[PDB]
């Protein structure tokens, strides 16, 4: 049986190849997770079909309906057999789906328009001139909503009531907002996307401060899936062979169009 | 029928260390450290009583080629001598094949420790010279890394280390640190970044971590394959990290009382 892989269009993990309109199937995409999927499948011995998550979200649980959306939802409801994307390993998710050991490390970080008067999260919380938000339906937003740390708590109180909305539908939108806000908007996103955007034209953004936390991305499968074991061992072998580092260098620093 | 959980761990600073008056203390009270605190937090969150026991052979864990017998903490789990391992045990493929690991509670990578002033800033530097000797810890993931690497530079380093005389391998991290400190810069030690940065903050502040890490991995809490404690332990680790506890514990044992400024 062909394995259904749910993923999300997020640079440089999964992107549409140039001329993708005349391409079909898996050949339409390119990126770190596209290469990763190939390696995993190769090591686990299964054929697969890449599909972009329907609602374009990562995965959150609606406090009301208590339904899961994004990639997490597709795994939970049997729409997909596995998730191969920059999906953050978290407690709430781990309670409904399984995660392989992490294939990449990261932490929430700050992205600013070059020249912006901000060096840390604490800075952002002390001022009101510069707005700041996060992605929706993701682990970053949850981070602030559940944080009991003074600074983060303060930032959350501000963000959930900010007007206009400081939350964005996609990372691209958060980035575009920073670039077009003349420094009046700072975006909170994972260090991985941050450092990637940092090395791309027009090279007008940069990462400031340390990471707010430390965690990783994991390949996810429906709770109690037979693929779980082989996938986990595959991630470990790939990391030990140095493949994960090669892929990281290939989609991140190689083609460094910035200075 | 709830029973006291046997925790195998290892005397490795600052994860597990003997308290000052350890001889006036008994049981778990004899020890202090990052993993001692971690054990308490996990036990609390999972609701179990435990007994900390230092691994007999003082090794992390390796499979003897030929007899296929595992030693160290990994062996304690495999042969049922312990119920769980709470220590800086590196999550690796060969180990995950015989025991279970929770998600990472700490991140690290192999690194280089030098005596200050030593003319080395990378693994490549080490591989192109013979004046400065270098080695790793025995029965661990670092030695296995070089032994199994297909990467040119690392293969070259392993080829040199495995046959150097006298032996460049040490039985304990402490022995490796001593060798770096007393060898006038003629010895460089390969060890995990975590131990490296801890030592860098200890007197007499004569060692330094140089270059980036050779890899990126983590430490996990290990349990015998199929253990019932597995699930709860994994979740506990995740909750602790999200609460910021783990970041707090590392600063406590690494920097809060650093001895080098
Ligand atoms: N990897 C995140 C998605 N997301 O990307 C960011 O940069 N922030 C954020 O929430 C997830 O798995 O929910
Ligand atoms: N955590 C390592 C033990 N060890 O510590 C080092 O610094 N190198 C090394 O092999 C393991 O689990 O085998």
From Swiss-Prot, chain A:
Inducing stimuli: Down-regulated in the pyramidal cell layer of CA1 in the hippocampus by global ischemia.
Q: Which residues bind L-glutamate?
A: 86, 88, 93, 139-140, 190
Q: Where in the cell is it found?
A: Cell membrane; Postsynaptic cell membrane; Postsynaptic density membrane
- Output the superkingdom of the source species: Eukaryota
List the expressing tissues.
Detected in forebrain. Detected in dendrites of neuronal cells. Expressed in the pyramidal cell layers of CA1 and CA3 and in the granule cell layer of the dentate gyrus.
PTM comment for this protein? Palmitoylated. Depalmitoylated upon L-glutamate stimulation. Ubiquitinated by RNF167, leading to its degradation.
Topological domains, Extracellular: 117-259
Residues modified as Phosphoserine are 147, 181
Q: Site described as Interaction with the cone snail toxin Con-ikot-ikot, positions?
A: 61, 145, 237
Residues at site: Crucial to convey clamshell closure to channel opening?
118
Positions of disulphide bridges: 203-258
Q: What does the UniProt function comment say about this protein?
A: Ionotropic glutamate receptor that functions as a ligand-gated cation channel, gated by L-glutamate and glutamatergic agonists such as alpha-amino-3-hydroxy-5-methyl-4-isoxazolepropionic acid (AMPA), quisqualic acid, and kainic acid. L-glutamate acts as an excitatory neurotransmitter at many synapses in the central nervous system and plays an important role in fast excitatory synaptic transmission.
* Comment field (misc): The postsynaptic actions of L-glutamate are mediated by a variety of receptors that are named according to their selective agonists. This receptor binds AMPA (quisqualate) > L-glutamate > kainate.
Assembly, per entry: Homotetramer or heterotetramer of pore-forming glutamate receptor subunits. Tetramers may be formed by the dimerization of dimers. May interact with MPP4. Forms a ternary complex with GRIP1 and CSPG4. Interacts with ATAD1 in an ATP-dependent manner. ATAD1-catalyzed ATP hydrolysis disrupts binding to ATAD1 and to GRIP1 and leads to AMPAR complex disassembly. Interacts with GRIP2. Interacts with GRIP1. Interacts with NSF via its C-terminus. Interacts with CACNG2, PICK1 and GRIP2. Interacts with GRIA1 and SYNDIG1. Part of a complex containing GRIA2, NSF and NAPA and/or NAPB.
Entry remark concerning the domains of this protein:
The M4 transmembrane segment mediates tetramerization and is required for cell surface expression.
| Family named by the database record | Belongs to the glutamate-gated ion channel (TC 1.A.10.1) family. GRIA2 subfamily.
This chain's protein is named: Glutamate receptor 2
Organism of provenance: Rattus norvegicus (Rat)
Instruction: Provide the taxonomic classification.
Output: Eukaryota, Metazoa, Chordata, Craniata, Vertebrata
Query: Its encoding gene is what?
Result: Gria2
